[PDB]
Design brief:
ATP binding (chains A, B); congenital muscular dystrophy (chains A, B); Phosphorylase Kinase, domain 1; homodimer; binds adenosine-5'-diphosphate; about 350 residues; binds the ligand C[N+](C)(CCOP(=O)(O)O)CC(=O)c1ccc(-c2ccc([C@]3(O)C[N+](C)(C)CCO3)cc2)cc1; disease variant (chains A, B); lipid metabolism (chains A, B); ethanolamine kinase activity (chains A, B); three-stranded antiparallel β-sheet; about 45% helix; alpha+beta
Chain lengths: ~350, ~350
Amino acid sequence: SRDAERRAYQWCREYLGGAWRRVQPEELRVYPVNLLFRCSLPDHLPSVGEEPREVLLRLYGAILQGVDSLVLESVMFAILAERSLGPQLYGVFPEGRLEQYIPSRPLKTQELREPVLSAAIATKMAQFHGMEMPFTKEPHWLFGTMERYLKQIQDLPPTGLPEMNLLEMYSLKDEMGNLRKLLESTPSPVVFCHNDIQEGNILLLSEPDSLMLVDFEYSSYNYRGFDIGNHFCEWVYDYTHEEWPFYKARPTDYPTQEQQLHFIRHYLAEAKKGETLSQEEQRKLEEDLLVEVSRYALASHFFWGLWSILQASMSTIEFGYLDYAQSRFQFYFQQKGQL
Amino acid sequence: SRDAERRAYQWCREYLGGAWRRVQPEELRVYPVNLLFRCSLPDHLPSVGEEPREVLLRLYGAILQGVDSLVLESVMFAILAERSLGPQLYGVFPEGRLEQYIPSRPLKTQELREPVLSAAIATKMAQFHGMEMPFTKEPHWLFGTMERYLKQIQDLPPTGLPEMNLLEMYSLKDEMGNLRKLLESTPSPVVFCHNDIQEGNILLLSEPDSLMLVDFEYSSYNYRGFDIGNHFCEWVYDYTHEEWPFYKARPTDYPTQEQQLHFIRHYLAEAKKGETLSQEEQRKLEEDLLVEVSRYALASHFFWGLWSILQASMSTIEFGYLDYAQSRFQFYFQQKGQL
Ligand SMILES: C[N+](C)(CCOP(=O)(O)O)CC(=O)c1ccc(-c2ccc([C@]3(O)C[N+](C)(C)CCO3)cc2)cc1
Ligand SMILES: C[N+](C)(CCOP(=O)(O)O)CC(=O)c1ccc(-c2ccc([C@]3(O)C[N+](C)(C)CCO3)cc2)cc1
Ligand SMILES: Nc1ncnc2c1ncn2[C@@H]1O[C@H](COP(=O)(O)OP(=O)(O)O)[C@@H](O)[C@H]1O
Ligand SMILES: Nc1ncnc2c1ncn2[C@@H]1O[C@H](COP(=O)(O)OP(=O)(O)O)[C@@H](O)[C@H]1O
Ligand SMILES: [Mg+2]
Ligand SMILES: [Mg+2]
């Protein structure tokens, strides 16, 4: 649309500067990749200084985001950029931001299991967990957010859908306490977590450090075990499935013990790189982490199942959110019973 | 106060973590340095990881700051920290932030003229001007802000003070156009400027890179000439004077031509360090910059004079804001006439 093109043009010229000052309106169009758009400097123009030739314009939702929330999100994004753990940040303004376009493609679900890529993901996740960030270090995110989601679900206006509420079908309010008790018995260090290391958020670089993570919507200080366990759960789900419900679950694609240990070995090699450990101490760290993840992986099911019920309340036919929620809760109980 | 101590305690434990988790309330008190407070970890405690032992708690005003303004301020502060151009950032929360306490003292007015310190200030200012920041690069800050201040002054409710309005005494609305025309004829590159490089914002490090700038309240993309000229104006004003109006002006302390060239040589040595320039090209850059600064220094007087009238509207006997404004406008006209 004429207005959207004009805004993108103005934002690029004003926030990027340099060669962008010489671009004429008729030479620039936005390409949707929807709230995300690619903007490219015309080929005939040389760059002036270090200003980027390739950016992504990210527009914020029509949805209300609090002031404090936007401060935290923007500060987080800016810091991860400086530390080379996310895309560079080139503009912040009320409507959105301009980010580095990373030449890349996202991973696919099946690629997560390839040993060399899985080792690289482990290494990157551990790098992320090494970050000191200016946010609360108290680990209230996991159960605080789940408690909030449950309250929000309880408060939803009735819609007319006749089915038993999933909170009741799966006794989720009671079950949350059972999970809390289990995880309270399971030590897991509190670290800066990504919280959504799915294939769609892992970019395979065309100009390799071979990967970059994106999508920090959910990132927070949280239990290490959640970030790893959540990643393992993602081996099961493909969100590119082309028929309703527009995801597919393959439960047998959950990582085997050997696949989990391979990831864990590479994770710990990075996490513990500055430490002098015997092979025996290393073995213990690996075994303990295997158990830790087996339990915190259950929180991935529980968290996303609750989140998905809320998504269903704002959706119709574009994705089977309620179906997905039920899949996560079924796997929760199955895996809980296999402990 | 009990409440303020408790809040500081909670913020330190929650945002700093590490050894701060082991601190007991009775071991921590805040020291005012008022919205700024020092918090120190007890001496008996060893640090756990990289968490700071010495922080400054900065509380935000009771005064309204917009959402977008707080995003920009916080992002700016976080980026300058990463680039080692400001204090590290350890917590952001609705009420304020936790920053690195920099072991240091501020410079004094008379120290600005010492050649070795002035060379270091020039070098640091040029470093700051090298920054690419995710903010508007269009140079509307100077006249946009002055136009806004003038409008705000025009809109002030009458107070009962009988004196001629300084806007009228000095014909400032007309004079702003005269200044704009002068500066429009004076090329000055647009760079990321500090905008308030006064002695009180230059910290002399106890653990030396010998200086750190602080106070980014006014920082923005702006004309280089303003940042340098503003700094030179600051050689004249001491804000520690102990009798009303609580500043002192020493007009003869404005830098001589030689003092200005000394600063300029060191500024350009840093700004142009990656460039192959002849001694002749270097001489021209120095001479041109001398003229540039002579003109943009006038904007320092004009800007702060307007700002000071606004400060007077919220002040009584703590500082002679209106007196200060008049001093800046008198010097503006004197120096304009000496061009
Ligand atoms: C577990 N998970 C990590 C939760 C957080 O998700 P995000 O990382 O925020 O996406 C992923 C997840 O639950 C998820 C991921 C993707 C989708 C999704 C995928 C595709 C669509 C779709 O509208 C489906 N379509 C058939 C209409 C084609 C265009 O894309 C809509 C939703 C829905 C749910
Ligand atoms: C030109 N300048 C760089 C403008 C921006 O100032 P800031 O860097 O934001 O301070 C500095 C400036 O105009 C200025 C600087 C300092 C002061 C100031 C200095 C001292 C006080 C005072 O309340 C005075 N006191 C006698 C009551 C003792 C305690 O401190 C109050 C105000 C007033 C004005
Ligand atoms: N900085 C970037 N560079 C290149 N591609 C990106 C970038 N950020 C996101 N993408 C692409 O856009 C997709 C969605 O972006 P993301 O930040 O994950 O937002 P969301 O998943 O909330 O829509 C990613 O899967 C990736 O393909
Ligand atoms: N990070 C810091 N470390 C040590 N001292 C600081 C720090 N920040 C500010 N100060 C001290 O506090 C004073 C005021 O802080 P500043 O950030 O300039 O705020 P303002 O001038 O708006 O009150 C400085 O002159 C300096 O003496
Ligand atoms: Mg994503
Ligand atoms: Mg200051």
